[PDB]
Design a protein around this ligand. Structure first.
Ligand SMILES: [Fe+3]
Ligand SMILES: [Fe+3]
Ligand SMILES: [Fe+3]
Ligand SMILES: [Fe+3]
Ligand code: NA
Lengths: 347, 347
């Protein structure tokens, strides 16, 4: 039926205290997790309506409330819990960041993935010190309910550059796709959140996040990341879709004239993207004619690259029934179930 | 029959010396114009085949050769000379950058615009000091063959922010569209050239230029530049087309949820763009099925915002007969002549 590839479980900073190494544990006990936020005030908060659990705190913080509202509410075969901790990549201390990710991966294993069969996990790593991220991927990637690695797209340079390759080597060797998720662009020591620098308000910052993915993606393709690690899968989570055709054409046209500068590439850039990359659908783009979005998919044979997600319980939550309704049934099968069942090797 | 809204006349740095005050003249005579280039080496170079004039200098440097090879080799009724000096916005000294722009505008008027009727020009200004740019727009904007202002997309912050508004105010007051053109991104004291920072190779830098336009465009709309200045037209020159619809759909969707934060907006973001912005066609996007580009246009009704340009004499130059052969005649007339004729009020 349905696999949701982006479900944000949440937790009080103090939920990680039992899993944190010293000195980082004492830090969090005294001040919470030193997240270095983007600094763009959204007024509609982040969460949707009536997702705050009974008695609980943050929306998404109660496994039982989420089994009910999401797993059985919308009949989901599997849900990939992606948490929020990958955002710590924006902070300044590489060891603090890795230690927080390490404690979260354990917490997720101990307290979430065993509470339902549908529950699967993205392991989080910090990108400031890619060597520590490789360690964590090898430490914990073997767990049978851990199906991918989650990275923030708030980095210190384009993600295709060699400083990061230890992460791709480790994930590809383990068979774990690398998911990339926005949220922290511009915070702490990451790069400016848009090519033109820092916008003034949240609506600009949010709209522009897709452009970070385009930059990172051009870097990963042209730096030959997929030539160097032919087993790598990259999943672009929550960054839009409709921009991909134009990027594909622009990048292919430049490649035709510029191939000699990038000789490790032996097929067109668009084919590397199609063969190695996936994109989640949330927040689904809404042309006035919904048929248009589908026409866009078909223009670049992207039905095998698209993964449904709800992004429960955020304000732009996508219920599966209302998304992509004019899709052929065989394409709807692929985007709602089969692409992800294959990608994560589920069942 | 045809109007070409982006043609790069070139000149020897030394050609500005008669228009330059000291100490600027002495610097140019000794060291050329201090362009802070992208620092990305193009192996082809920025120039076309067989465009180097007889015995003359750079391709595009000779009015009579250009009149022959371009203005009449293709049956252009008007060509908008845009030069390359607007790239000087990347440099560190605002007074130097303004003087350079002022000397170029004087040179363009005296040595180019009168040498043929099809010649129309784009006054250039430096963005480091928008007050000096406003003064230059008022000095020169009234000339009968000056049809627009030209600024570089390599800025120190998103171009919709209030720091730049004196430019838009002066252009609108003189009935001049404001054109934006890539080329200097990341040079000197401008912002990093992509949202992810600095890529390693020309092919990435060039591909990602569209994203700079996307960020500036979202800035101008959301900062209410088209509400503050309701008689302002903006021309996105040489930055692609196929990304527009996904941007229009993402922005409109966020607008619906976030309109309270941006109350000066009393219409959908997509509609400010449709009513205030144009985009040149070069470099024409080349999908496998050239129909897919046109299908893309009609999804957003963009036939009224697209302006043909050849971008002579660059490597990704576009010959008129070759681009958009699939267009309906009425759409072709608009894109190749009618949009530009109305915009610049020619004839
Ligand atoms: Fe998400
Ligand atoms: Fe979200
Ligand atoms: Fe140009
Ligand atoms: Fe060019
Ligand atoms: Na920063």
């Amino acid at each position: 039926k349905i696999i949701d590839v982006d479900v944000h479980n949440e937790q009080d900073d103090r939920a990680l205290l039992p899993y944190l190494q010293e000195p980082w544990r004492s830090r969090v006990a005294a001040s919470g997790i030193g997240y270095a936020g983007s600094g763009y005030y959204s007024p509609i908060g982040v969460m949707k309506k009536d997702s705050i659990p009974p008695g609980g705190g943050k929306a998404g913080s109660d496994p039982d409330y989420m089994i009910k509202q999401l797993i059985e509410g919308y009949n989901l075969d599997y849900a990939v819990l992606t948490g929020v901790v990958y955002n710590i990549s924006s902070t300044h201390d590489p060891d603090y960041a890795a230690a927080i990710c390490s404690a979260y991966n354990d917490y997720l294993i101990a307290e979430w993935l065993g509470k339902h069969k549908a529950f699967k996990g993205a392991l989080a790593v910090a990108t400031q010190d890619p060597l520590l991220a490789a360690r964590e991927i090898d430490r914990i990637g073997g767990h049978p309910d851990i199906v991918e690695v989650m990275i923030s797209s708030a980095a210190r340079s384009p993600l295709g550059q060699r400083h990061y390759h230890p992460i791709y080597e480790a994930a590809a060797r383990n068979g774990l796709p690398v998911a990339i998720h926005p949220g922290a662009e511009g915070g702490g020591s990451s790069t400016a959140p848009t090519a033109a620098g820092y916008p003034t308000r949240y609506i600009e910052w949010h709209t522009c996040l897709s452009q970070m993915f385009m930059a990172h993606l051009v870097s990963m393709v042209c730096e030959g990341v997929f030539v160097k690690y032919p087993n790598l899968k990259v999943v672009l989570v929550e960054g839009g879709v409709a921009w991909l055709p134009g990027l594909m054409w622009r990048l292919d046209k430049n490649y035709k004239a510029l191939r000699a500068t990038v000789p490790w590439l032996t097929r067109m850039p668009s084919e590397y993207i199609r063969d190695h990359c996936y994109l989640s659908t949330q927040p689904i783009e809404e042309p006035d004619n919904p048929q248009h979005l589908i026409d866009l998919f078909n223009m670049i044979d992207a039905e095998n690259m698209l993964l449904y997600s709800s992004d429960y319980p955020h304000w732009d939550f996508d219920s599966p029934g209302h998304v992509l309704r004019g899709l052929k049934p065989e394409a709807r099968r692929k985007i709602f179930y089969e692409n992800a069942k294959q990608l994560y090797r589920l069942d």
